[PDB]
Ligand binder design. Structure first.
Ligand SMILES: Nc1nc2c(ncn2[C@@H]2O[C@H](COP(=O)(O)OP(=O)(O)OP(=O)(O)O)[C@@H](O)[C@H]2O)c(=O)[nH]1
Ligand SMILES: [Mg+2]
Lengths: 308, 326, 333
């Protein structure tokens, strides 16, 4: 009964420190399995990129926020800005699914911390480098990139993702992960057929030339009798006597149902092979650390910093 | 009787002077029935000016009961014109390079239309329904000083024969426009503190990025007053469905005080002397009139919408970094 | 005793002396002479201290009338009179005889300020009057609650605040139609004369607002059909006269209260459609839409059994445009 000893986590683990420093505290929870899913999330300051990871990896929609693996925003929202997720965290669900809730790319809280206290000329051109370093590390290492967005069609996000691909260090065919566009805090409008078609058209025209698998295996789980009207793509929206006890017309699927149907997709996401080998959960950490050193001291960023 | 149009508004030859005070309205908005800028225009003047139901279609509207000329910009950053852009780019206008150049041209037209607000305006109201200061605007505001300076003589040489006055022709604008950012709420006394936090964050950002200098810079500080409003969490058709549930059974300014606290400094000629650093205190109120303002804006639009201005777009080098990197 | 009086002149001794108030005579004027001299922070404490020591029949109320030096020095002190009159409850000095005229003088001066002195010096007056009745007080109040406030520069909630005065005071004086008569005598004069002017529009809207401020309370008598003439003489000076695109908000609200007293018996309702059917001329203002749709509800309440034809047919593409984001106008439509 001892030949099958499992291992689980309780809270997140930060690979990249607050000052962008790699950590070796995740190997303790790693194993020698081959098929290891690695889903990362990128988004704005208050785009809600950790609550999604928490509800997808271990937690559920019906559970206290303090119990979430990744700390959410409870009292920091009302206070000065946000950015409670300093660095890239780490968590491997019982299903061996690695989760990476990075910091908010292009966040004002990080800029304020930098201004109040680094090898650059201005802190504003530095918060954009950390964002690029995290976007390139989330593309060369992760199998899925959950691009969370508080509000829909942030042209800055679509123009930044296309800039993170340019920094993606290839030659370890170029490995390009998927792209799940989560519309966190979605209103009743986002769940309309016309709104769905408009969103698909907009995200297909903005990401028309990305080379990233942003379309194909999403947005067709919980809807009406609707056949595929638009060129469907990866887009999963997440909302925010007896007659008298009728709940109001939410207009969107239940939060629990959407969380479940998104977790099922994330777990079922295609897990293509890594750069050049299987890179088991143990080899992966030895493959994501080298990528971190190669991107933090890469020529792509060294040249992009001068253009800023 | 006022028509929400800018191109037709400037092409005029009633309310002549009016001691108007123009207010620019730009920023990003989400896909909704009523745009954020339209809702702001409707709530400010206390009337539904824009009744609900790939260019920068800048439209103006004058309020006789308030003497305010709201100029709202439809920059590509907005998701209303971006939808039409992606629709026209889907069926018939493009390769990767051509699409990138199209997006770059759209962003350049947006920056041009925005410089038309930082050049002829008094107050400015941003729109970002996230409650988080978009750092990108920094690189945009740092990309407008270049155009506001290099394209400065190109604008002075086109507004000389205008009754705007001496200071307006000197600095090319009626007065330093005050930025009053306006963010919408999504999840949340609690808002009173968030406003001050965002104000401090924006101040620190613009001070560390040189976006808010101690002189006649493109923007202003607004230290005494407040320049960070937070909208309450209505817009779509859900009030009727929420009224069915009821029919079957049977401090903290709001879009007027937060904006009037700054509009009075221009309507009363108080000015925008909110400067720090023991400077010379250059504060030219320059309270314009509808006739003079239209006379100036006609030339400003004819020059920017551009003989040499069209050749200054390459002088930015702050938003097309992707092209140079590639 | 007398020592705490001097100690009340830091705040430690003042607080220690404030406890003796729950138990002399020289302390009555002490707070009135100290609260009006010290800062604003340590003013309400003193104002409330002496309000629990004695009956203060004529000692406390004496120097309060002589507080014309400053506004706050008078408001805080008159708060003492209010509290003592609300605490006595035995009808010795509380809304009393000719002495009470002092407070009337106060009411005659509270209009000079921004109505801050009226926030409390008018709300407790009707409650202080429990046995003795007075009707001239209503007229002396309305002389400024609607004239000075008509152009007091917002001057927005002061009208509603003073409305409660007549509500709590107009219960008596069955023959209260004299106020309406005096407000409507110059009503038609200012309506028909002379031309489109700001002063005119202002006084007209003020008189109209008074028409409802006073009507809200006058429901007792009679009404021997005089309300029909009121409706006619309120509709005539606004339907054809202006005709100026002024603020019809109160102009549209006046007929509301005017007709709210007749259910079905009889009226000239035929002459009401043009009054209401002609008001829907887009598009101003957001509050004007509600103030005009409410007359629609009033007319529908008067069309119990005799109305039909073009009335409803005019609801095809005319009033359906008031279904926008505005929640108020949404429900009012
Ligand atoms: N994403 C999301 N957030 C919500 C929702 N409802 C309330 N919130 C609040 O919005 C905040 C943002 O969510 P998070 O994902 O936890 O934020 P985060 O991942 O820490 O990202 P940062 O703001 O950069 O720290 C949370 O702290 C919640 O308190 C919701 O439906 N979706
Ligand atoms: Mg987080």
């Amino acid at each position: 009964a001892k030949l099958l000893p499992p291992e689980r986590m309780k809270h997140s683990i930060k690979l990249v420190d607050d000052q962008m420093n790699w950590c070796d505290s995740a190997i303790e929870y790693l194993l020698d399995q081959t098929d290891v899913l690695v889903v990362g999330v990128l988004g704005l300051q208050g785009t809600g990129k950790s609550m999604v990871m928490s509800l997808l990896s271990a937690n559920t929609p019906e559970e206290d926020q303090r119990t979430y693996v990744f700390r959410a925003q409870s009292a920091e929202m009302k206070e000065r800005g946000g950015n409670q997720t300093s660095g890239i965290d780490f968590f491997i669900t019982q299903e061996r699914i690695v989760f990476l809730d990075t910091q908010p790319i292009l966040s004002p809280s990080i800029l304020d911390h930098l201004i109040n206290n680094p090898e650059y000329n201005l802190p504003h051109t530095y918060v954009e480098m950390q964002s690029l370093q995290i976007a390139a590390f989330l593309f060369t290492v992760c199998h899925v990139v959950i691009v969370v967005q508080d509000w829909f069609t942030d042209l800055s996000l679509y123009r930044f993702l296309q800039t993170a691909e340019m920094v993606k260090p290839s030659t370890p065919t170029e490995y390009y992960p998927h792209l799940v566009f989560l519309q966190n805090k979605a209103r009743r409008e986002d769940f309309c057929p016309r709104k769905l078609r408009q969103m698909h058209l907009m995200i297909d025209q903005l990401m028309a030339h990305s080379h990233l698998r942003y379309k194909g295996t999403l947005s067709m789980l919980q809807c009406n009798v609707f056949p595929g009207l638009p060129p469907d793509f990866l887009d999963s929206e997440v909302n925010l006597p007896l007659f008298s006890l009728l709940p109001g017309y939410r207009g969107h699927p239940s939060f629990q149902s959407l969380v479940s149907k998104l977790r099922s997709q994330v777990m079922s996401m295609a897990r293509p092979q890594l750069s050049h080998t299987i890179l088991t959960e143990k080899n992966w950490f030895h493959y994501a650390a080298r990528i971190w050193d190669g991107v933090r001291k890469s020529s792509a960023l060294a040249e992009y910093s001068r253009l800023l | 009787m006022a028509g929400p149009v800018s191109l037709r508004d400037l092409l005029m030859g009633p309310w002549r002077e009016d001691e108007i005070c123009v207010v620019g309205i730009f920023g990003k908005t989400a896909l909704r029935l009523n745009s954020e800028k339209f809702s702001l225009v409707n709530t400010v003047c206390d009337r539904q000016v824009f009744p609900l139901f790939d260019y920068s279609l800048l439209q103006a509207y004058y309020s006789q009961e308030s003497k305010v000329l709201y100029l709202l910009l439809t920059s590509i950053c907005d998701n209303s014109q971006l939808l039409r852009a992606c629709r026209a780019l889907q069926s018939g206008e493009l390769p990767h390079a051509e699409a990138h150049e199209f997006w770059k041209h759209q962003e350049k037209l947006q920056c041009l239309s925005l410089l038309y607000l930082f050049s002829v305006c008094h107050i400015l109201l941003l729109v970002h329904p996230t409650c988080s200061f978009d750092i990108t605007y920094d690189r945009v505001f740092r990309a407008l000083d270049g155009l506001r300076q290099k394209v400065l003589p190109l604008l002075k040489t086109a507004i000389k024969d205008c009754p705007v006055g001496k200071d307006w022709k000197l600095n090319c604008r009626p007065c330093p426009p005050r930025l009053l950012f306006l963010f919408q709420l999504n999840g949340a006394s609690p808002k009173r503190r968030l406003q001050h936090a965002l104000e401090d964050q924006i101040y620190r950002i613009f001070r560390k990025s040189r976006v808010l200098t101690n002189q006649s810079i493109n923007c202003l500080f607004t230290v005494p007053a407040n320049q960070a409003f937070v909208y309450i969490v209505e817009d779509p058709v859900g009030m009727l469905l929420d009224q069915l549930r009821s029919h079957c059974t049977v401090v903290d300014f709001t879009l007027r005080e937060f904006l009037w606290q700054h509009v009075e400094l221009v309507l009363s000629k108080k000015g925008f002397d909110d400067s720090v650093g023991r400077n010379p205190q250059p504060s030219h109120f320059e309270l314009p009139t509808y006739q003079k303002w239209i006379s100036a804006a006609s030339k400003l639009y004819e020059v920017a919408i551009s003989k040499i201005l069209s050749s200054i777009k390459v002088l930015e080098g702050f938003l097309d970094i992707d092209t140079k990197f590639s | 005793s007398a020592d705490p009086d001097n100690l009340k002149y830091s705040n430690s001794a003042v607080v220690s002396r404030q406890r003796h108030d729950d138990t002399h005579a020289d302390i009555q004027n002490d707070e009135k002479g100290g609260y009006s001299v010290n800062g604003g922070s340590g003013e309400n404490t003193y104002g409330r201290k002496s309000l629990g020591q004695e009956l203060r029949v004529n000692n406390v109320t004496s120097p309060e009338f002589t507080s014309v030096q400053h506004g706050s020095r008078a408001l805080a002190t008159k708060d003492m009179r209010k509290s003592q009159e609300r605490s006595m409850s035995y009808s010795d000095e509380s809304r009393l005889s000719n002495l009470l005229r002092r407070i009337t003088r106060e009411d005659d001066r509270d209009r000079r300020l921004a109505t801050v002195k009226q926030l409390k010096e008018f709300i407790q007056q009707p409650e202080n009057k429990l046995v003795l009745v007075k009707q001239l007080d209503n007229i002396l109040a309305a002389v400024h609650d609607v004239l000075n406030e008509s152009s007091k520069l917002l001057q927005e909630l002061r009208q509603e605040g003073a409305c409660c005065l007549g509500l709590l005071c107009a219960s008596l004086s069955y023959e209260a139609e004299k106020i309406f008569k005096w407000i409507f005598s110059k009503f038609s004069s200012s309506a028909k004369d002379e031309v489109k002017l700001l002063y005119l529009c202002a006084t007209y809207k003020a008189l109209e607002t008074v028409g409802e401020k006073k009507a809200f309370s006058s429901v007792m008598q009679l009404v021997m059909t005089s309300l029909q003439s009121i409706l006619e003489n309120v509709d005539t000076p606004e339907l054809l006269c202006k005709c100026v695109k002024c603020i019809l908000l109160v102009a549209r609200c006046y007929p509301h209260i005017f007709s709210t007293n007749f259910r079905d018996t009889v009226d000239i309702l035929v002459g009401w459609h043009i009054d209401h059917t002609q008001k829907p001329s887009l598009t101003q203002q957001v509050s004007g839409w509600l103030q005009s749709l409410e007359p629609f509800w009033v007319a529908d309440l008067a069309f119990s059994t005799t109305l039909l034809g073009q009335f409803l047919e005019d609801m095809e593409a005319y009033a359906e445009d008031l279904s926008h984001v505005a929640s108020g106008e949404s429900v009012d439509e």
